Scaffold this active site. Structure first.
Site, PDB file in Angstrom:
ATOM      1  CB  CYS A  46      18.749 -18.361  67.128  1.00  0.00           C
ATOM      2  SG  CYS A  46      19.547 -17.641  65.503  1.00  0.00           S
ATOM      3  CB  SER A  48      17.590 -19.010  62.236  1.00  0.00           C
ATOM      4  OG  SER A  48      18.371 -18.297  61.829  1.00  0.00           O
ATOM      5  CG  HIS A  51      13.993 -16.495  59.761  1.00  0.00           C
ATOM      6  ND1 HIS A  51      13.399 -15.072  60.324  1.00  0.00           N
ATOM      7  CD2 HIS A  51      15.471 -16.002  59.520  1.00  0.00           C
ATOM      8  CE1 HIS A  51      14.492 -14.060  60.100  1.00  0.00           C
ATOM      9  NE2 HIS A  51      15.531 -14.721  59.784  1.00  0.00           N
ATOM     10  CG  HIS A  67      19.493 -23.215  65.265  1.00  0.00           C
ATOM     11  ND1 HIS A  67      18.487 -22.621  65.260  1.00  0.00           N
ATOM     12  CD2 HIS A  67      20.513 -22.287  64.988  1.00  0.00           C
ATOM     13  CE1 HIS A  67      18.683 -21.329  65.153  1.00  0.00           C
ATOM     14  NE2 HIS A  67      19.966 -21.172  64.808  1.00  0.00           N
ATOM     15  CB  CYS A 174      23.439 -20.147  66.602  1.00  0.00           C
ATOM     16  SG  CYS A 174      22.945 -19.527  65.128  1.00  0.00           S
TER      17      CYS A 174
HETATM   18  N1  LIG Z   1      24.374 -17.021  58.682  1.00  0.00           N
HETATM   19  C1  LIG Z   1      24.262 -17.913  59.929  1.00  0.00           C
HETATM   20  O1  LIG Z   1      24.696 -18.971  59.982  1.00  0.00           O
HETATM   21  C2  LIG Z   1      23.109 -17.174  60.934  1.00  0.00           C
HETATM   22  C3  LIG Z   1      23.254 -17.654  62.219  1.00  0.00           C
HETATM   23  C4  LIG Z   1      22.502 -16.828  62.928  1.00  0.00           C
HETATM   24  C5  LIG Z   1      21.648 -16.009  62.387  1.00  0.00           C
HETATM   25  N2  LIG Z   1      21.442 -15.593  61.310  1.00  0.00           N
HETATM   26  C6  LIG Z   1      20.613 -14.734  60.752  1.00  0.00           C
HETATM   27  O2  LIG Z   1      20.975 -13.491  61.224  1.00  0.00           O
HETATM   28  C7  LIG Z   1      19.916 -12.414  61.468  1.00  0.00           C
HETATM   29  C8  LIG Z   1      19.993 -11.984  62.954  1.00  0.00           C
HETATM   30  O3  LIG Z   1      19.717 -12.903  63.819  1.00  0.00           O
HETATM   31  P1  LIG Z   1      19.628 -12.253  65.224  1.00  0.00           P
HETATM   32  O4  LIG Z   1      20.673 -11.422  65.516  1.00  0.00           O
HETATM   33  O5  LIG Z   1      19.284 -13.616  65.993  1.00  0.00           O
HETATM   34  O6  LIG Z   1      18.323 -11.483  64.836  1.00  0.00           O
HETATM   35  P2  LIG Z   1      17.597 -10.293  65.711  1.00  0.00           P
HETATM   36  O7  LIG Z   1      17.965 -10.280  67.111  1.00  0.00           O
HETATM   37  O8  LIG Z   1      16.182 -10.239  65.111  1.00  0.00           O
HETATM   38  O9  LIG Z   1      18.232  -8.940  65.392  1.00  0.00           O
HETATM   39  C9  LIG Z   1      18.134  -8.180  64.049  1.00  0.00           C
HETATM   40  C10 LIG Z   1      18.247  -6.928  64.008  1.00  0.00           C
HETATM   41  O10 LIG Z   1      17.906  -6.394  62.960  1.00  0.00           O
HETATM   42  C11 LIG Z   1      17.359  -5.069  63.282  1.00  0.00           C
HETATM   43  N3  LIG Z   1      16.628  -4.813  61.919  1.00  0.00           N
HETATM   44  C12 LIG Z   1      15.571  -5.020  61.616  1.00  0.00           C
HETATM   45  N4  LIG Z   1      15.265  -4.331  60.308  1.00  0.00           N
HETATM   46  C13 LIG Z   1      16.058  -3.430  60.057  1.00  0.00           C
HETATM   47  C14 LIG Z   1      16.460  -2.313  59.126  1.00  0.00           C
HETATM   48  N5  LIG Z   1      15.842  -2.368  57.928  1.00  0.00           N
HETATM   49  N6  LIG Z   1      17.862  -1.885  59.171  1.00  0.00           N
HETATM   50  C15 LIG Z   1      18.604  -1.951  60.255  1.00  0.00           C
HETATM   51  N7  LIG Z   1      18.201  -2.838  61.427  1.00  0.00           N
HETATM   52  C16 LIG Z   1      17.053  -3.635  61.166  1.00  0.00           C
HETATM   53  C17 LIG Z   1      16.264  -5.379  64.278  1.00  0.00           C
HETATM   54  O11 LIG Z   1      15.861  -4.221  65.133  1.00  0.00           O
HETATM   55  C18 LIG Z   1      16.974  -6.344  65.360  1.00  0.00           C
HETATM   56  O12 LIG Z   1      17.710  -5.643  66.129  1.00  0.00           O
HETATM   57  C19 LIG Z   1      18.682 -13.492  61.162  1.00  0.00           C
HETATM   58  O13 LIG Z   1      18.133 -13.267  59.750  1.00  0.00           O
HETATM   59  C20 LIG Z   1      19.077 -14.938  61.423  1.00  0.00           C
HETATM   60  O14 LIG Z   1      18.208 -15.644  60.804  1.00  0.00           O
HETATM   61  C21 LIG Z   1      22.284 -16.279  60.425  1.00  0.00           C
HETATM   62 ZN   LIG Z   2      20.922 -19.330  64.506  1.00  0.00          ZN
END
Ligand SMILES: NC(=O)c1ccc[n+]([C@@H]2O[C@H](COP(=O)([O-])OP(=O)([O-])OC[C@H]3O[C@@H](n4cnc5c(N)[nH+]cnc54)[C@H](O)[C@@H]3O)[C@@H](O)[C@H]2O)c1
Ligand SMILES: [Zn+2]
Ligand SMILES: NC(=O)c1ccc[n+]([C@@H]2O[C@H](COP(=O)([O-])OP(=O)([O-])OC[C@H]3O[C@@H](n4cnc5c(N)[nH+]cnc54)[C@H](O)[C@@H]3O)[C@@H](O)[C@H]2O)c1
Ligand SMILES: [Zn+2]
Ligand SMILES: [Zn+2]
Ligand SMILES: [Zn+2]
Lengths: 374, 374
Positions: A46, A48, A51, A67, A174
């Protein structure tokens, strides 16, 4: 043959930010009262977890991250009643203690026993079950799934269907549940609505799946990586836009495309600027925007509160708003009954020993989810 | 007789910011198609009118302010179907055109014909019905109630009960409906909940009234002016706190008092800092915070989006979320049926000619609502 004994096994230890994981032997203590030791089968990568590496999500180091996972119970501590040895389980990075005011609230899911708001990197009792090179290693979100064995508190594990395919249903731990619930439970997307989804990774694709399940008429995917668009359309996006293609800010573009703003928007990236853009692009009087992306540690956004005064609703959630222990087994059962698909999220499979290649795939933009097999 | 003729009458003109109102003769043109000319009977002094004076709320000057009022229709333009000469009416500072996407939406009320977002200070047709000393004078929010006569668009007036006491029900034109609706409609306060209300002026007292009507168990009033507490308790506050009395920030105090955060909070002041404090004091997983206070022109707040990611809901609204023309007559009928009280909001009743004295009472902290009588 290992109950009550220390287990030596391989884990991915993060000793330092911005460095590869170290695949090396750790000692995993046996479970104490109300703890569960799990032989991991599959874990997803993920954003995160990344991160943690980048220092976007601060948690004590050194650490065993991970996770989003599934495994099989190896042993249970004294007083455990909800799982048994040999059960298939998903670790719950958001616990469900069942006792706190949030767990008792009909909407609430961010249990007060969580280790996300002010991470300590321990078990509930404030100690660690992990040793590496004779040194204690932190836990991550009570789960620490980047290890052949982990120990979790009972409130941080759910028993799932014995016939579950663990290499798929790990995503219920997740990314799928988060995105899907953010749409169906947190936003409560309505039939015929227009949605905008910022970020088309595993979580954003799961948001699209939920918007489509809810009957949205239009689902606009937004990503700066146009390679993400084809899969977003496969799972329900009606159109995709790259902000980099436009002279005007994308909130203006989306407002024009939606004839005055979208019904529901989702920030699924983790940037302060896209959180404000996603709020702005929802219709000023009745729009709803949900923050899903994890923001950079300790940073504040700036916004004009007139965006809210006109009528917008702004909210966020962890884990799609799902009460974790209640919801995870039901989501697995629904998966088994083909109520949603997980394969569209899985772009790569690797052995656990290739974890660093799996993070390279995420960072390059190539992957959605890589599933690691132990 | 006045129908079809210019009326010369008395109004309170604001020629520039941070000056007293000028009480003098204006000319009021007759109503054009789909317009209504109203003889004013009573108008309240709302803090938003003071914001026009202070430059907190930008609208074109010179202006006839006033938006919280009631009067009697003097004449109607061609094509008016919803009011007739002699009817008691409340001007609607939020119109209800009935045709725009917001008016057709079940939860929208900020009609796209409003003059609040991007104030022009005119009638719908982009012209003014007011002159003073040979100069055109702007309208305010399509109402302009600080005048013996005004002209409003039909979508900015509601007919009310012919037996209505206009010196009381003028408050349904802004402060009562705003605060009450913010609690019962926008927040949807629940029975047994704990509420915190920041700002105990006419609007905040109306929020308390709504929270008590919704069955809240605890209603914590928050004001830096402890002279506001007695009346807050009379209309339902269970306790009041002055941030100036504490060494800790009041969000920490309120979180402690509510054993981990309130269910519902309301910002009813108009300060960026109290908007963020009010959000922070609601429970992190399931709390709701509503912004009611008008913020200072063009200023942005700073906040940590983790406040939303944990599960809080943040929203704002104009006019309590009520669809104005549908709601105002029903609110007046409910008042006539003794479903709520208005007298607790009225501290002063003055002739219209004493408008500046009424504003001085508000600015000194000594009034809730002054009603001006024509
Ligand atoms: N709230 C929760 O419980 C929870 C759970 C899982 C993930 N997250 C978060 O959710 C986010 C996405 O997770 P993921 O899908 O695994 O990540 P990921 O696979 O990195 O997807 C993020 C997407 O954002 C795109 N991106 C980056 N910058 C920009 C921009 N300026 N404009 C538009 N698109 C852009 C990027 O190209 C990518 O496809 C991350 O910050 C995670 O930490 C939160
Ligand atoms: Zn996650
Ligand atoms: N959203 C809407 O449709 C709408 C409608 C009506 C009024 N308003 C706004 O709502 C706000 C309240 O209006 P009102 O009730 O007429 O005003 P008011 O009567 O001036 O009441 C404001 C109260 O806030 C108190 N206050 C000032 N600073 C602080 C502080 N730092 N901490 C705690 N309390 C403080 C003050 O003592 C007073 O009792 C104003 O900003 C109005 O412009 C908005
Ligand atoms: Zn709990
Ligand atoms: Zn309208
Ligand atoms: Zn007002």
């Amino acid at each position: 043959s290992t109950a009550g004994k220390v287990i030596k096994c391989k884990a991915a230890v993060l000793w330092e930010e911005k460095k590869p994981f170290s695949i090396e032997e750790v000692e995993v203590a046996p479970p104490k009262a109300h703890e569960v030791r799990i032989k991991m089968v599959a874990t997803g990568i993920c954003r995160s977890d990344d991160h943690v590496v980048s220092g976007t999500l601060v948690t004590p180091l050194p650490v065993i991250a991970g996770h989003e996972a599934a495994g099989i119970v190896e042993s249970i501590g004294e007083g455990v009643t909800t799982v048994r040895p040999g059960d298939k389980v998903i670790p719950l990075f958001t616990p469900q203690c069942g006792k706190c005011r949030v767990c008792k609230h009909p909407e609430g899911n961010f249990c007060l026993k969580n280790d996300l708001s002010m991470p300590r990197g321990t078990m509930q009792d404030g100690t660690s079950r992990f040793t590496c090179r004779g040194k204690p290693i932190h836990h991550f979100l009570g789960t620490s799934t980047f290890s052949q064995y982990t120990v979790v508190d009972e409130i941080s594990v759910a028993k799932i269907d014995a016939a579950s395919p663990l290499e798929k249903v790990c995503l219920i731990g997740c990314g799928f549940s988060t995105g899907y619930g953010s749409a169906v439970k947190v936003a409560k997307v309505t039939q015929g609505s227009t949605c905008a989804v910022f970020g088309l990774g595993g979580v954003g694709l799961s948001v699209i799946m939920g918007c489509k399940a809810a009957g949205a008429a239009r689902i606009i995917g937004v990503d700066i990586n146009k390679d993400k668009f084809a899969k977003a359309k496969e799972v329900g996006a009606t159109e995709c836009v790259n902000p980099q293609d436009y002279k005007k800010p994308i909130q203006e573009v989306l407002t024009e495309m939606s004839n005055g703003g979208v019904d529901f928007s989702f920030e699924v990236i983790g940037r302060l600027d896209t959180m404000v853009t996603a709020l702005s692009c929802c219709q000023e009087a009745y729009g709803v925007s949900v923050i899903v992306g994890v923001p950079p540690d300790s940073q504040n956004l700036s916004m004009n509160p007139m965006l809210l005064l006109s009528g917008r609703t702004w909210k966020g959630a962890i884990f799609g708003g799902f009460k974790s222990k209640d919801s995870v087994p039901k989501l697995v059962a629904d998966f088994m009954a083909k109520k949603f698909a997980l394969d569209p999220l899985i772009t790569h499979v690797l052995p656990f020993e290739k974890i660093n290649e799996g993070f390279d795939l995420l960072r390059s933009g190539e992957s959605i989810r890589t599933i690691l097999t132990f």
